[PDB]
Amino acid sequence: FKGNKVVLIGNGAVGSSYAFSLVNQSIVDELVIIDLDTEKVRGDVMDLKHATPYSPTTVRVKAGEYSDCHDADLVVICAGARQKPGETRLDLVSKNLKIFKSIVGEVMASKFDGIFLVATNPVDILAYATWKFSGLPKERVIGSGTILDSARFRLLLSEAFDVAPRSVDAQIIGEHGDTELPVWSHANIAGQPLKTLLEQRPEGKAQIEQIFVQTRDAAYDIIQAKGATYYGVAMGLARITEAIFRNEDAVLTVSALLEGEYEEEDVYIGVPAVINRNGIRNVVEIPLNDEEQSKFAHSAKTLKDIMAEAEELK
Amino acid sequence: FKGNKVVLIGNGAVGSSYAFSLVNQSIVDELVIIDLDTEKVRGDVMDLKHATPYSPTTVRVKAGEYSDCHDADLVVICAGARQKPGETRLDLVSKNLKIFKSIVGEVMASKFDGIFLVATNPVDILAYATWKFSGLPKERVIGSGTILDSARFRLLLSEAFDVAPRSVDAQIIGEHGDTELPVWSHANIAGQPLKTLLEQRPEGKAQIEQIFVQTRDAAYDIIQAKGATYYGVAMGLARITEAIFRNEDAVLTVSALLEGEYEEEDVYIGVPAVINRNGIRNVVEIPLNDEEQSKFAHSAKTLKDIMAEAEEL
Amino acid sequence: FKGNKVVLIGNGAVGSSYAFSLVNQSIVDELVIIDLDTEKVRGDVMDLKHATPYSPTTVRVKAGEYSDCHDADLVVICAGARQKPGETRLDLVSKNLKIFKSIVGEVMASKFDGIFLVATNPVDILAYATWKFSGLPKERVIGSGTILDSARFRLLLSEAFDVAPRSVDAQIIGEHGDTELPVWSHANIAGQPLKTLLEQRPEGKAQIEQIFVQTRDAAYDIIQAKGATYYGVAMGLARITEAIFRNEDAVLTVSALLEGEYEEEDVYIGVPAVINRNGIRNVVEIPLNDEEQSKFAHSAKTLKDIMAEAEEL
Amino acid sequence: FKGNKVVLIGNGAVGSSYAFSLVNQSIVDELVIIDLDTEKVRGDVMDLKHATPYSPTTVRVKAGEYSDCHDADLVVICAGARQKPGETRLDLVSKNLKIFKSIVGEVMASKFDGIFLVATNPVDILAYATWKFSGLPKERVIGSGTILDSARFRLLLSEAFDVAPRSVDAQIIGEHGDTELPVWSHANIAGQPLKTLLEQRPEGKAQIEQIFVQTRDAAYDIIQAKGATYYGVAMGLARITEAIFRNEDAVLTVSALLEGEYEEEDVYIGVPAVINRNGIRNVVEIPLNDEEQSKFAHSAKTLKDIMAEAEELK
Ligand SMILES: NC(=O)c1ccc[n+]([C@@H]2O[C@H](COP(=O)([O-])OP(=O)(O)OC[C@H]3O[C@@H](n4cnc5c(N)ncnc54)[C@H](O)[C@@H]3O)[C@@H](O)[C@H]2O)c1
Ligand SMILES: NC(=O)c1ccc[n+]([C@@H]2O[C@H](COP(=O)([O-])OP(=O)(O)OC[C@H]3O[C@@H](n4cnc5c(N)ncnc54)[C@H](O)[C@@H]3O)[C@@H](O)[C@H]2O)c1
Ligand SMILES: NC(=O)c1ccc[n+]([C@@H]2O[C@H](COP(=O)([O-])OP(=O)(O)OC[C@H]3O[C@@H](n4cnc5c(N)ncnc54)[C@H](O)[C@@H]3O)[C@@H](O)[C@H]2O)c1
Ligand SMILES: NC(=O)c1ccc[n+]([C@@H]2O[C@H](COP(=O)([O-])OP(=O)(O)OC[C@H]3O[C@@H](n4cnc5c(N)ncnc54)[C@H](O)[C@@H]3O)[C@@H](O)[C@H]2O)c1
Incomplete structure (x- = not known):
């Protein structure tokens, strides 16, 4: 015991x-x-x-x-x-x-x-x-x-739509880094289609871009201001730890091995996955639109290319 | 609203x-x-x-x-x-x-x-x-x-007696600093008299002293190791903040103004106090044994003497 | 204070x-x-x-x-x-x-x-x-x-798809009662389209219907078994109470007054709304597909017709 | 896992x-x-x-x-x-x-x-x-x-001294029932001796008695008003459950087997005990004053006498 x-x-x-x-x-x-x-x-x-x-x-x-x-x-x-x-x-x-x-x-x-x-x-x-x-x-x-990237995306959206972050369901997938992608085909507040709503605003296309750019480049912005980031990731790590020890079967975007999901294999990459006391129960395979499919494939390839050049991995 | x-x-x-x-x-x-x-x-x-x-x-x-x-x-x-x-x-x-x-x-x-x-x-x-x-x-x-000193005291006792920290009721009072004092007349686990039990062990007096020395000097020990302290105090500040915003009437050892309690006046010093949405509702006056009375009065005097010399004050 | x-x-x-x-x-x-x-x-x-x-x-x-x-x-x-x-x-x-x-x-x-x-x-x-x-x-x-109907819907979906209830975003809107409707245009797990996935299963249409029927009729089923319901609603009331006292701006499906939203007026009905210390900050207007538009208008009319006949009202 | x-x-x-x-x-x-x-x-x-x-x-x-x-x-x-x-x-x-x-x-x-x-x-x-x-x-x-009796004693004391229940350290030990006893030699708020303080009040002796009587007879008072008690015990059970699954080593007054502690053996009775993932780690043996020693011994005997007459226990 x-x-x-x-x-x-x-x-x-x-x-x-x-x-x-x-x-x-x-x-x-x-x-x-x-x-x-x-x-x-x-x-x-x-x-x-x-x-x-x-x-x-x-x-x-x-x-x-x-x-x-x-x-x-x-x-x-x-x-x-x-x-x-x-x-x-x-x-x-x-x-x-x-x-x-x-x-x-x-x-x-x-x-x-x-x-x-x-x-x-x-x-x-x-x-x-x-x-x-x-x-x-x-x-x-x-x-x-992308536990952290997803949180940043949600945080920026909660500001843009003025609601609690807990009420924004939105995800970043792919590499935790420059080839990451927002899942705009999903991002919503109780079913409000956030990208569509943003597009209706003046220079909405600009705002849609800024929200993603501030998500992708957050680590750089924080590093420029104070030298390192740590609170966001610490909290994200705590969240995963909780899903494990409370055996939740909660879906979180984490870096998981793909073995055929999203048509990719032999690469760890940020995806929604079911988390419980045993760790990753399974990768969750969501529909991606054409832009998302194209970006996710490119992110996987970016990671797989770098892995193939890492002598330590051999 | x-x-x-x-x-x-x-x-x-x-x-x-x-x-x-x-x-x-x-x-x-x-x-x-x-x-x-x-x-x-x-x-x-x-x-x-x-x-x-x-x-x-x-x-x-x-x-x-x-x-x-x-x-x-x-x-x-x-x-x-x-x-x-x-x-x-x-x-x-x-x-x-x-x-x-x-x-x-x-x-x-x-x-x-x-x-x-x-x-x-x-x-x-x-x-x-x-x-x-x-x-x-x-x-x-x-x-x-002493929100933090009391926590350190409880932590060291919880290790000495091998139980949860939340099962140790123990307090440091006085200056947050070198003239602070342990309230051994009170310190207990479900009524176990901690000083008395420690005194029963081999070199118990020594253990009793080391527990307080490690409490009193914790800040210096942490600073020596990593240059500053911050987690203990952050957690203590969060505890006080919780008592206020959840209107708890919780008793916590904090620095409060004395106006007659413990026979001291015109000095902020660490004492148990009731905390609620309005802040400090009142200082809690507990009985102190002769040693504790002696040390508390000395701590108050030490702070008041420093305040008396402070240009800004 | x-x-x-x-x-x-x-x-x-x-x-x-x-x-x-x-x-x-x-x-x-x-x-x-x-x-x-x-x-x-x-x-x-x-x-x-x-x-x-x-x-x-x-x-x-x-x-x-x-x-x-x-x-x-x-x-x-x-x-x-x-x-x-x-x-x-x-x-x-x-x-x-x-x-x-x-x-x-x-x-x-x-x-x-x-x-x-x-x-x-x-x-x-x-x-x-x-x-x-x-x-x-x-x-x-x-x-x-529908704070409670939405929870039941989420619970039944969480069993159908085998994940945590907190990982299902799904809503019931309309009357808390027989004219309520599921928002299948929205219901999802991390973006998985739940109605579409269910339709892919053997007798999927049947499963889709049974999930909503068990949501709609839950109160009757519980009453048949133990005479009244109380835990689900108590928990939902506590959730709303939390959103208020923690000033959350959280989106929750509650009964709110409509004054133009969803093309309805002068009726309280279940809709997503932003909740904070001041109560309902605003109703959230989400896009509904044709079936949902039809059913929501019918639910509103049903309530308004009953209100029109109520002596006390 | x-x-x-x-x-x-x-x-x-x-x-x-x-x-x-x-x-x-x-x-x-x-x-x-x-x-x-x-x-x-x-x-x-x-x-x-x-x-x-x-x-x-x-x-x-x-x-x-x-x-x-x-x-x-x-x-x-x-x-x-x-x-x-x-x-x-x-x-x-x-x-x-x-x-x-x-x-x-x-x-x-x-x-x-x-x-x-x-x-x-x-x-x-x-x-x-x-x-x-x-x-x-x-x-x-x-x-x-006495997880529940201790909570009632603390609740009544928190009202009498006007502080949070969390700030009252007080215990009931013995049988969960009529031979239970308050541990007045311990009961305190940050070291304030509650019985002594009560005794200083007018008819303080009366108030000290009422506080214990309302503790001992709480189940009867609630049963008279609504037929059964359930919230207090449910919460007490939850508290114990928490100490187990969060592996706390928390001291709680629960019914534990004594094998020599308090000079009693072969009887389950309410005492402070250290609770963790393994259940009861050990009984905690506290000093009792003469009145408390006498009442605790009588409670143990009351329970042991009834057990000796229970044919089902044979
Ligand atoms: N995944 C994310 O979202 C995210 C976010 C921020 C930072 N990071 C990364 O996390 C890492 C840590 O960042 P940081 O700011 O804490 O750096 P840091 O320099 O503050 O700490 C690094 C620590 O690693 C210790 N260490 C180095 N080699 C070790 C070894 N062989 N064995 C045991 N300890 C060793 C060092 O002594 C140091 O204490 C970096 O790689 C950073 O890029 C990830
Ligand atoms: N009470 C306790 O238990 C406890 C524990 C640890 C530290 N402390 C005290 O806390 C204080 C802060 O310690 P630290 O480690 O955070 O120091 P630090 O050097 O890390 O930070 C001090 C901060 O104060 C800011 N500051 C200085 N003057 C300011 C002003 N006029 N207006 C707005 N900001 C100003 C500085 O810019 C800096 O950001 C120190 O006095 C330390 O002794 C108390
Ligand atoms: N919204 C939901 O999801 C939901 C769920 C379950 C029940 N309900 C409704 O909640 C209501 C209460 O249900 P219940 O099971 O608790 O009923 P209940 O019979 O157990 O309790 C009703 C209480 O109302 C009290 N009461 C009646 N008139 C009163 C008055 N004028 N002033 C003060 N108290 C008065 C009664 O004395 C009784 O104590 C019912 O209308 C039930 O239909 C709603
Ligand atoms: N320890 C405490 O602090 C405390 C407090 C209150 C009540 N109690 C006791 O807890 C017990 C339950 O009280 P209650 O108010 O819930 O009673 P209750 O009548 O409401 O419930 C008793 C339940 O036990 C079930 N049951 C009876 N025999 C069973 C069996 N052989 N197998 C499986 N289930 C069986 C019954 O069907 C019923 O559902 C009583 O003994 C009461 O004295 C203890």
């Missing part, structure tokens, strides 16, 4: 923010933190512990090492190099594949047999790498993917 | 962590953020907004200016200088009093008439300054005080 | 279940309960209070009278006759209109100036009566309407 | 109220309901399901049968006869021991191997019976016990 145990690997801006989300939300009762930078781990574990007395239910936070993964239920990896102003996520594949080779190896050696959730960029390729490196079933390796 | 509006002033490590706590907890539906550093604000407001679609209920985050305080319900101040390794919180007094004279003046000029909640150090003196600069009733000016 | 106060009028199966939902959810900090049956109220208020120490945040429950409505923020009406096996909700109109003339008059005489939320059946007509008897603006009078 | 599954046996006022709490609180993702009265089960399951779309996270509700207990994590028993005005809880032992013999037998036959939580009265004796009938470790059989 064990409790729920999360091991976080990588305790920088993103990891520590995710840790604080877990302390606020009490999704799990035990969190173990691993990082090369043991002193920052020490400092954050103490600071975090001091918040736990106000957590809705008990959360135990501790500094850990790889042996601690043996009975972990979820391993969350936020370790690695981040982009500078003027850099793309794909600009990181080389260094971060190096790092994941090491990390996932250390984890599997502890006899870990849970679920992986990865945030390190480029997240689709790193999720793919975690799947390949680990040998685990696809259901048990998840990338955060 | 207005919603609940918080203005954060000071969006650094502490302020932004508090803002993220509010995005996670959905205590209020509107958060406005002010800092001299407008670029950091723009960046944080964006990053935070992107978390809000997953908030339990709607939270709107925006960059603001003082004029936005006119109809604010709570102003939370986390602006100012922090301490370096080696420094105490009292070392910050002159610098942060000058800053508060400016901030509080700009807030009051907006016609603000809500509640203030202060974290800037030294927090007891700065809560007092906020009360005096603002002219507001004492019920409406709160310092975070 | 007032807290949030709800007065429940009608403490039967529905009212007491709603009260228990509020004790579980801590949406508001104060709940006052009125019923002619003062013994049941005394008994429920006690039982409920005993649950409150485990509520997420403070909830105070008490027995009240109309005078207690003076500073209430929300009055929720669940008082009146329910239907028997075999009866429709429209059968209740004359009896429950007489009751509302009395209740609403007693509330308004207390100087109440908040929001009304109505569950008594037939709920659309009784929300309309509440608006007219009270003289309050339409934003401040809400019927629960 | 299974989710969390609760089977409720007995779907009357108490059981159905507990079920509605679980739908509001989303403690677990799956609830199965068993009752002889299959029609009321059918009606409640439907009514409850229709609430689940607004649950914080997914809750699946269904009508079940004993075979469904095979992989249940928690079985909650609220089945059986309830008291009439003018009756005590011990007035039920005979009929309800009969019923538990049957129920627990049917459950164990399904190969259930989780935790039992019992509410049926008299709850201490019925928890003891569930332990004996089932053969399960004491850690895995819990009675609701």
